[PDB]
Design a protein around this ligand. Structure first.
Ligand SMILES: Nc1ncnc2c1ncn2[C@@H]1O[C@H](COP(=O)(O)O)[C@@H](O)[C@H]1O
Lengths: 146, 150
């Protein structure tokens, strides 16, 4: 947040998924991410916890035109796997002439397929990612002597 | 119908998508050290056709556990069942056979994770937090975005 407004990563949805992604990116790159969260209470709690998060609706074209389309964004993470959130936000992003990368995480197989078909650069399954992270974090915390 | 886990050092209870990602992630780092237990016979067969050591069985059933040989190098159990109470029941079964190694669990909500810790697991992680972490990790590795680090 050295230069406010200059986030290079947008994380759309700051539930547990978005937050996990936010924390990982911070660890690697420092403070280059902005998370977007529709629930105001949730956004305020993230800000209290020291994360760069604002409230707003990633399906609203005006929020895109007024706020999110800054010209600095290199990567957008779609972390709204329920209620067609990912696909709806993707639609808005594509209307804007966005030249960066897009990645999505989805709950089911056919959902990943539709996201890739609609032009996301990379798509992942929530649970397969969770299993991979789980195994790493366990080996980190417990250091089993294999 | 005794079950000899052989050289397995990790028992993975539940081989749905979570257990499978864990199995594969461990295989990548440590080689063939895991044994998956899966209630769905057709899923267990599909895992075996893919080269994974997976046997069918219900890890909530005391009769399943009675089949398992006390001789074993198992140092880590991953609780990756699809139903939260299943992980809790599996943990109880492991405790009443006096298992000494470590146990890790994954769940949906902080109360579930705290409850697993209270019940005796060594580490407890949230399914969706872990998903977001691995999501970001894999996106960076696949896509190699060019950021200015701050
Ligand atoms: N349109 C949206 N804009 C920003 N955040 C959202 C939007 N829809 C859902 N979220 C948040 O994304 C997270 C996961 O949402 P869900 O897709 O319901 O699991 C939750 O914190 C939601 O409040």
């Amino acid at each position: 947040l050295i230069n406010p407004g200059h986030a290079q990563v947008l994380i759309l949805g700051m539930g547990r998924i978005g937050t996990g992604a936010y924390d990982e990116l911070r660890a690697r790159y420092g403070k280059i991410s902005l998370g977007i969260e529709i629930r105001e209470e949730a956004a305020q709690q993230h800000r209290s916890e020291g994360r760069n998060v604002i409230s707003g609706d990633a399906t609203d074209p005006d929020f895109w035109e007024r706020i999110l389309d800054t010209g600095h964004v290199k990567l957008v993470l779609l972390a709204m796997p329920h209620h067609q959130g990912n696909q709806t936000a993707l639609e808005q992003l594509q209307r804007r002439n966005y030249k960066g990368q897009i990645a999505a995480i989805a709950e089911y197989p056919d959902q990943l397929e539709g996201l890739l078909e609609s032009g996301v650069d990379a798509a992942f399954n929530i649970y397969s990612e969770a299993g991979s992270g789980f195994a790493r974090h366990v080996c980190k915390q417990l250091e089993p002597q294999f």
